[PDB]
Amino acid sequence: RFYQHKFPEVEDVVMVNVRSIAEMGAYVSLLEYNNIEGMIRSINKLIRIGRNECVVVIRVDKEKGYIDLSKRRVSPEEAIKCEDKFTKSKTVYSILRHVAEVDEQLESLFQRTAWVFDDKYKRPGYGAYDAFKHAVSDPSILDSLDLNEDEREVLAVKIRADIEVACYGYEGIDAVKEALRAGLNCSTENMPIKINLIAPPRYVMTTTTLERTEGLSVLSQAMAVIKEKIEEKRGVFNV
């Protein structure tokens, strides 16, 4: 089970997934309410088995298991909202399924994980995962979670650039350390963060993912060190 209810209410847009092809249409199951089954010339080919497709609800049920789904009269500009209802809630379902490790305990966990926020501020499947992203950055509202303690606080590539800069002289290595820590000092003021080293022979220094194309910053700071201080003591360079 994922959502609080068993069936969505009047005019709710539905992410849905077909299992098999019926005679009236296709037997289309529905994972987002724990696998409930409904309906919708070489149409009968089985190109659609197990793939999520956007749809909207049609009529009004109470309990009787009405699952029909009109692919035609849905609008695709609202289908991205249905995809946001799918993928964010799917990340929620995955991580919250890995929360438990050994049924209705999991369901009562689910109503006391996201439906607390969605009964305090009422956002169905959008502010839940984003409020969890808030909560892993700020668990202040998770202090209201008066659960047992151990369940509360539980809630790529980087450009590995490498230019080996070293000298044989003691004054040479002194200027190497001086201009390397000066390049760290210059990297502090302009603030490209996270330039460290895990290999003493080379400069295994990480052009990280903060702009994802920020090799220009580490590159021109590096080349300023290359042109500035060290390399009048035989700075000879390979890749």
Binding site: E164, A166, C167, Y168, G169, Y170, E171, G172, I173, V176, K177, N196, L197, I198, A199, P200, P201, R202
Partner: protein
Amino acid sequence: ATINIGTIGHVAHGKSTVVKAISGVHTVRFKNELERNITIKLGYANAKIYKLDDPSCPRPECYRSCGSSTPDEFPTDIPGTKGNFKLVRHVSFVDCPGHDILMATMLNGAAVMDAALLLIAGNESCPQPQTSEHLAAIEIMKLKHILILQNKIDLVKESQAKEQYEQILAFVQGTVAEGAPIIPISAQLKYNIEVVCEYIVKKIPVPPRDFTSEPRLIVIRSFDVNKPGCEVDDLKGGVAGGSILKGVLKVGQEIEVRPGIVSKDSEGKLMCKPIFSKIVSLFAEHNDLQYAAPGGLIGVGTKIDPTLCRADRMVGQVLGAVGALPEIFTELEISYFLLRRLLGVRTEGDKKAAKVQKLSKNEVLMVNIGSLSTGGRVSAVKADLGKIVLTNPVCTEVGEKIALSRRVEKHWRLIGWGQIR
């Protein structure tokens, strides 16, 4: 670091637990290939010696003086006493084993030690397989404090016991051993260590040793700990336990290895740019004495490229001070002679020892310049003058420790030596 003392032992008697018994610290490294009967590295220990009206030879442990070279029979002596152990001389034992495979090890750490002790084996045959081989490379480097460290008569049978050592001392005409008297030891029973281990230090004085000359260092270690997935700030140089031969090495002392990698348009040898190296960190075998006495070993820490010190491909590089007295030419001459046997295996045929294959044309050469075995192809080399042809422009000081290797099999041989002009 005043005097070094070198045990020198040839094939097949055991040099691991006897190094443990009388010297204390045993040699170990990584991917070591440490021994099969005797070792193949320099067996070095860290020693501070003291004598307190006691003939015994203690270690810097100041409570007892014994060993563990036998399981059953323990004769022992008056060991000494406690009380913040003193220091007679800055002495430390070293070893130089006797296979023919350790030419790097046996030729780099032998001219740099100070006293020598030649050992006679006790687990070999009735002929002498390698007795005239493994100080004949030490013949040209000209050590002085040399002694017959008589070792094994324990499991030795009586028919080959009491006279054949004189035949070994007569069979070593290629080894400077006639001025080497006998202070005996025991590799198993280690009997009566207070006289047995006494005059291997007490009789031996300082060698002829220069105090304040140029440090013209041939280095024996250049090692480093920078495995894949390493730390951040391991900026060091040659992390070495470094035996020095000449020159005081204080803090701020200057020392240069001039070629290293040969300079631009690599057919010359020198450009006037000295190699500036300030050795501050110096480990005096248990302490950080920055003021290194000549002759003895000290734990040397330099400051160069750390990439260049992982795998020591620099066995015997000349690091000399200012005042560049070494030579500048690439046409290497020697005043050589030949090995008379071709020995290393025992037999009664006199057939592989027939002749001495000289230099040729369109034929290879290799010879450990110090401990550096380079070569190349030759053009026209005469009969009795040794003109070594090479490929490395190196301002080495004097290659007075060379061994002319020559292929006959998977292993090379020993055919020559030589003294530089």
